[PDB]
């Protein structure tokens, strides 16, 4: 029972398109069948480094608890086309975030199905049971409004909004780049 908003999917596609050649990751925050109300990206390329992940998670927790949300999911898109299984980094990060709330489950953007319109749900949701991480049913419905997610992702990609998208790494480069990226949020609101 994992539920994420359409804006979460459009953010997924936006971050995948921003750095197509580099594996990316990040978190998804929700309020306390969980509904992932919002998302946040962080870093790309090298992902096995600990200090950035720790500082990130701390900042995510601070920002979310200041505004009543709590981090409740982890996403990671791998670099290789033929790769769809979680690595050590994703598994340990998902295990650590799931220590707080058991409803937290991992999601991975399967880059094999990544297309212009996102014809099929690219994200695959993995649950932790029996101390093991395994994928859910692919035939399950993932986004709340699949045609809406398709159209908004297509419009955002065709509008060249992926270049304007900013993740946590750009915030690290310069704080002047807003890591909360409300620009994509207002674009989503205008499109909807």
């Amino acid at each position: 029972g994992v539920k994420l908003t359409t804006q979460a999917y459009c953010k997924m596609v936006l971050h995948g398109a921003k750095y197509p050649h580099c594996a990316v990751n990040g978190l998804l925050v929700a309020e306390k069948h969980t509904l992932f109300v919002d998302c946040i990206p962080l870093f790309h390329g090298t992902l096995a480094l600990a200090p950035m992940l720790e500082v990130a998670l701390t900042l995510i927790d601070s920002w979310c608890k200041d505004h009543s949300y709590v981090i409740a999911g982890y996403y990671q898109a791998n670099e290789r086309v033929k790769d769809a299984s979680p690595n050590q980094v994703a598994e340990k990060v998902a295990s650590r975030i799931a220590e707080g709330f058991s409803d937290t489950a991992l999601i991975m953007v399967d880059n094999t199905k990544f297309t212009m319109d996102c014809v099929a749900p690219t994200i695959h949701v993995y649950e932790h049971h029996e101390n093991r991480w395994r994928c859910r049913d692919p035939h399950h419905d993932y986004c709340e409004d699949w045609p809406e997610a398709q159209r908004i992702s297509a419009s955002l990609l065709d509008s060249r909004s992926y270049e304007t998208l900013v993740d946590f790494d750009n915030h690290l480069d310069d704080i002047r780049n807003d890591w909360t990226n409300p620009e994509i949020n207002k674009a989503v609101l205008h499109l909807c």
């Binding site: 995948g16 990544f114 297309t115």
Partner: protein, 101 residues
């Protein structure tokens, strides 16, 4: 600015004109054969002023200095660039599948 370049040109032109004047004045002596043995004040003043302006322009034309501290131009090099390694590029990423094949 680029006008500096233009400036130096006129300076050389001025110097060139001085040469002509000097040549003519030499002909003067070669037709007067008097105990003058002195250049006109106008030509020497013009030559010196042309030299001054041309050298001042040339100093600008030489270019701009570069700082010795190696961390000057490397300050703006974010980590998103140094990691690319152009020789070791891999084309098995989501870019090809996502974009038009």
């Amino acid at each position: 600015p680029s006008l500096w370049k233009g400036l130096v040109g006129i300076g050389l032109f001025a110097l060139a004109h001085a040469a002509f004047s000097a040549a003519q004045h030499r002909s003067y002596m070669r037709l007067t054969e008097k105990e003058d043995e002195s250049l006109p004040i106008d030509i020497v003043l013009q030559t010196l002023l042309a030299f001054a302006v041309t050298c001042y322009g040339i100093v600008h034309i030489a270019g701009e200095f570069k700082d010795m501290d190696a961390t000057s131009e490397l300050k703006n090099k974010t980590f998103d660039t140094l990691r690319n390694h152009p020789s070791f590029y891999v084309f098995n990423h989501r870019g090809r599948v996502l974009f038009r094949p």
